[PDB]
């Protein structure tokens, strides 16, 4: 993010980080279940990448994390690589994450409901604070 | 580097697709959602990231971080994949595995 602030650590129970195996964070994601996850499709997630949860910093010599192995990528049928419409993906995990004070799940909308303009929402992540 | 080791938070407005075409036009789909242009933007490293809004107090996943200004400029709205338009498959997916 550009122009954010340090959230409260574990302030966001649901936030994951996505590492490849050069052990590097490439994309964000959200925990729906103990078993399941949601991310973006343009992220090019494979069975070979990792989900990290209940983390804070990446400098950690070690934090009390959860390095979780992927099972099956559930890509979206409709991801359009020029459009970027239907930019979604799902992750089933070899193992579940255990819900603590820090790790937990985001609630879901329905296609029925309205989240009207002018509404104050939030966004989190380890993206660039400066371009 | 412009890399945060620690997790960054941000807070922002929701835009009408009508309001968002003012910037993007032809590019907005029935399937996206715009937010920000209020002096913030997701940048690189953020994509796949959440977008939440509080409802009956519980925090709901409104949108996913897609794409945006070439420069992550703070005057430009960020585009997010609209969850509203994607859930039934999520629910249909988790319905089977």
């Amino acid at each position: 993010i550009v122009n954010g602030e340090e959230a409260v650590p574990g302030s966001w129970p649901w936030q994951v980080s996505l590492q490849d195996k050069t052990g590097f964070h490439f994309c964000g994601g959200s925990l729906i279940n103990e078993n399941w996850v949601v991310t973006a499709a343009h992220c090019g997630v494979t069975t070979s990448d990792v989900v990290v949860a209940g983390e804070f910093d990446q400098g950690s010599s070690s934090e009390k994390i959860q390095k979780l192995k992927i099972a099956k990528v559930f890509k979206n049928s409709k991801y359009n690589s020029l459009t970027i419409n239907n930019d979604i993906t799902l992750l089933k995990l070899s193992t579940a994450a255990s819900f603590s004070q820090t790790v937990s799940a985001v609630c879901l909308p329905s296609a029925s409901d309205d989240f009207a303009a002018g509404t104050t929402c939030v966004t989190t992540g380890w993206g660039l604070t400066r371009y | 580097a412009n890399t945060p080791d620690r997790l960054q938070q941000a807070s922002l407005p929701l835009l009408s697709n009508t309001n968002c075409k003012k910037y993007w036009g032809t590019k907005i789909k029935d399937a996206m959602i715009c937010a920000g242009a209020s002096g913030v933007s997701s940048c690189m490293g953020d994509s796949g990231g959440p977008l939440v809004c509080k409802k009956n107090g519980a925090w709901t996943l409104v949108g996913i971080v897609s794409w945006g200004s070439s420069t992550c400029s703070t005057s430009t709205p960020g585009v997010y994949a609209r969850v509203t338009a994607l859930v039934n498959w999520v629910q249909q997916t988790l319905a089977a595995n």
């Binding site: 959230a7 409260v8 650590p9 574990g10 302030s11 966001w12 129970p13 649901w14 603590s100 004070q101 820090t102 937990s104 799940a105 985001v106 609630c107 879901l108 939030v122 | 938070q9 939440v52 107090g57 519980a58 925090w59 709901t60």
Partner: peptide, 8 residues
Amino acid sequence: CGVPAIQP
């Protein structure tokens, strides 16, 4: 669901 123990 969507209640952090740690309140943000």
